[PDB]
């Protein structure tokens, strides 16, 4: 399933990045590229299935400690 990430999922990810003081360019896109073993250069280029995995990881991080 290669449906692109939807706007709702993107907005939840953006929310957590801001709360974590992290960014797509410095933090998340590099990690997504390593985990998904593919060149991911923009937030819009994730699949919805990939974005859901990233979102779960961000939720873990935001839930863990202040």
């Amino acid at each position: 399933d290669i449906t692109p990430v939807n706007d709702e999922t993107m907005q939840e990810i953006n929310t957590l990045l801001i709360a974590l003081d992290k960014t797509w360019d410095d933090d998340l896109l590099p990690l997504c590229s390593q985990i998904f073993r593919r060149d991911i250069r923009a937030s819009s280029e994730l699949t919805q299935a990939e974005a859901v995995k990233a979102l779960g990881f961000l939720k873990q991080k935001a839930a863990e400690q202040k």
Binding site: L20, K22, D27, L31, Q34, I35, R37, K53, A54, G56, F57, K61
Partner: peptide, 10 residues
Amino acid sequence: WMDFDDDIPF
């Protein structure tokens, strides 16, 4: 493979 279920720093 490292993946998003792992306890990796961020």
